[PDB]
Amino acid sequence: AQQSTWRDFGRKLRLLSGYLWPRGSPALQLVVLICLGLMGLERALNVLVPIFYRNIVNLLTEKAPWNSLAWTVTSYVFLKFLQGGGTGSTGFVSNLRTFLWIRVQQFTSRRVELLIFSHLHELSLRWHLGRRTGEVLRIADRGTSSVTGLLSYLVFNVIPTLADIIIGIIYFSMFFNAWFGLIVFLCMSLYLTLTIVVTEWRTKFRRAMNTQENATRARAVDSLLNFETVKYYNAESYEVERYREAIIKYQGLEWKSSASLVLLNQTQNLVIGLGLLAGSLLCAYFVTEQKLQVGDYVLFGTYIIQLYMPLNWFGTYYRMIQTNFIDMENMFDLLKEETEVKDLPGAGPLRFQKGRIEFENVHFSYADGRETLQDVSFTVMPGQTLALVGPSGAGKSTILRLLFRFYDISSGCIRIDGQDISQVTQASLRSHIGVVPQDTVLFNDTIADNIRYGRVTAGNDEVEAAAQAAGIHDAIMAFPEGYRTQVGERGLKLSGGEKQRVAIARTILKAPGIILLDEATSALDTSNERAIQASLAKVCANRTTIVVAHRLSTVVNADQILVIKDGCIVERGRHEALLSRGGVYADMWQLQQGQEE
Template sequence: MPGLFCAVVVACLTAAYGLLAREVINAINAGQDKQLTRLGLFILLLFVVKGVFAFAQTFLISDAMQKMARDLRNAAYTHIQSLPLRFFEDKRTGQLMSSVTLDVPTIQESLQATLIESITGPIIAVAAIILMFVMSWQMTLLVVLVVPLYVWIVQAAGKRMRVASRQIQERFQDVSDVLQETIAGVRVIKSFTAEEIESQRFREHSQEAHRAVMRSVRVRAALQPTIELISTTSFVLVLWFGGYLITSGHSGFSFGALAGFLVAVNQVGAAGKTIGNIKLTVRRVEAAAERLFKLLDTKSDLLEIPNPVVFDRCRGEVSFERVSFSYTDGTPVLQDVSFEVNPGEAVALVGPSGAGKTTVANLVPRFYDPTGGTVSVDGHDVRTVQIRSLRRNIGIVPQETLLFSGNIRDNIRYGRPEATEDEIRNAAIAAHAHIFISELPAGYDTPVGERGLTLSGGQRQRIAIARAILKNPRILILDEATSSLDTESETAVQDALVTLMKGRTTIMIAHRLSTIRNAGRILVLDGGRIVESGTHDDLLASGMMYARLYEMQFRKTDADDSEQGD
């Protein structure tokens, strides 16, 4: 690596200072003017060369560290995207964000600051100690006596720094959690006039982060003067003993040798401080790297078999055979669920909250694997199908539509970035979205804002439907796609859904009667089991759970529809 080579050159040139200092002092004492001139020019040249290599080492190593940080960020983000939904059930958003936004910069900045020093420090220290032995082995032994004390102090400080660094990461993760949560929930906070409560909560977490940082600052602040005291002690001992050798007429030891020896001692002391800082920084990096690589080492439980089935365009047949499922706590959500959906058939899932409707929908695109039984598409167990090709054939319109930052066009073609303008427009027309899009000042170039909040719920939902139409899936999953809309918006979205469902296998999690009536068959779930199956009229006539749900949830809708008709 060129940057490391430059660092070695800089260290070697720096290590020569003591030898040069000895020669300069000796030339002065001997009155050698020409030798002094040559030494002066040589020192000037040495500093020019050192400056060139110092610039190169800083630039090249910084570039390498920035690329490393970029690759780590990309790897962390890509890995997070590859993990299954089960992974996110017990993870806080701030925790994952801090791994990318806090841990990676900590590693990069710390390594960048210490990599050069970790090369130059030991080289300078070793070269200086060799020079000291050449000048006076007696004084060198005197200096070496303090090394064990120095090592013990650095080791103790390093252990405390690692604990402090881990606490810093955790406290700033808490700050990130609160910030993300309160920004996302700002409407709720304002509706309850809870701004001061949340501000106080943020201040408390921020103060905890401050305390954690100051604990690490105390360690570092105490280490520096301690090492300086040890270095100064060595310097004073050398000055005293060297002066004694000169005044006592010790042969072979001159003022120049003493000056060179003092410079070398000073370099060893500076290198010692540098190595101490490196030790503390390494402990800090260890805490950040531990969290980051724990994330990167997390394995997905949705594994593909070798040579999986690859769907080009599936028929759309969906089958559940004695399927059971439970989340991480082990509580069964689905128990012995079996049903089939023929290609092009529309099936509605109905039941009370917690009955397992959304879980059924999540098993089809293999967001989770069942804990028992088999989920099949076109006769193939989804665990034997390439995940990417399976999900390419499935379109999902959720209850709460998420639009990404960008414009309307980008959001419609999210599943097909290569789509043409005509295809985008035709999808919007089919989704009953083209008219309102055309009325916007910038049309399809209109920014939707974060999560699409500049648009109404009905408009966001129709864009989501246009997105699904453009994807042209064989299997469609509607997760209560109209339940949060007003009557006018629901009518527009319902018309768009009718277009979307034509010729596609559809599994709809039903909430409103108007949606259920579009289904050819209705499955009623309760307690994770299918308790009824049939058409709307058949289930009403049975007088069982569906009829009770109808009475509770849907009669008011029929009454409202009748009043509007009158």
């Protein structure tokens, strides 16, 4: 229950990383089994090959014919080839183990990254505005690389290194005289303690260096963005002198940081030299003079400096483990709770005998932000043109946003045909109704598979039926590549109303039950819209149509309109009556006829 690094670490491993591989089950567990087998084989070879080095030295000092030497030295060169030298040539089986490990690394990275990317298509848009999304994608894929590097380094470069230390200290404690193992243990404990102490002494100097670095960069960048000001008042020498003393003090701080780093290197060198100074325990100390051989010296001198080379790399792991742990908690905690979605059981899709919609007393405020609807209730028969054309506040878009189930509002629930919307599922509502946006964004793809996006699986009718029904067969046959023009925004800007008519073509390829015009054009001239409205309102048919606008040449229904004020209806009138009797829309009509010239 405490805030530490084993309660959450033990909670996230309760069979969560246990079904990590349920896809390639015949031929993926064999890969990790062969990787563990090669890891154990390499840990065995690291102890096995200096024994053969000692055998070569003992056979040279105790002279033998060439048949007892040639196969021995070729087998030694072979067994050293299987484990490489030191850092150089990285061994024969370790890099092969990484070449086999890269496939399951790609598999687990693909799994966790698709899990994140599939999680970020639920959890609603109310939370869809943190302030940015490039930063959350950057911490997302840094977190995926972080968790795969963390698991790889923790299972490959910490635990096998410690196992090599344990098998070496068992070797020195059992097989020479149980005297060298005390030296190895004290030297390695002193090495690790001095390394972590000078590392935690160095981190604050590095942080001060970074703060002085971005301070002395921010002192210069604003001085050079003010070029006109520095060409004024002829004071360039003062600014270059101040930047001179700023970079002087920055060089002083990073000189302190470099002094800390070379002191770390000096302490590691002093510890490894004092540990290697016990090579004088190979002469006249009941060693090598009475009861040991010649190769027992070179075995020590090879194996001690052999097992100390992975201990150099404790630098640039510890900070990497810290950054990987903070990236793991950032990707684990700050991404996955819930926002709004209620897919409760016992839910039929929808009921669609007609196209009615019904409203009863909606009440919502934007989390005590922008004021919005109150006391709105009306009933629309199947097949009707309805306008929401009041002043440009929040209640206009409010009608457009709410029927699509972005968020719940009040105890009262909306009733489309015969069932409330809080009980039924999401996908039937998102499929049976279809809106027309204010502006259409084409993806970086062709024009033909931007019209495809609603239906799916083309079917070879989108250039034949949808392009002709929108009246755009000429312009889809007026492309240099025929119709496959592979630009959405990285090439030519297409037009203003062309994006709206291709959104209407997408709506035709959706075939909705209730269409919600949502601010039809709002960007270009009305002379194109009033000319091509016979094809724009072809999708306007025997179905419920709800349109919002402010250029009121489109609203010519003359049946009933619902001019809104501050999210509150006070008239619930109609077009001829709001031009005649209840003038609020009439005053807007006077100022609009004054606006037309």
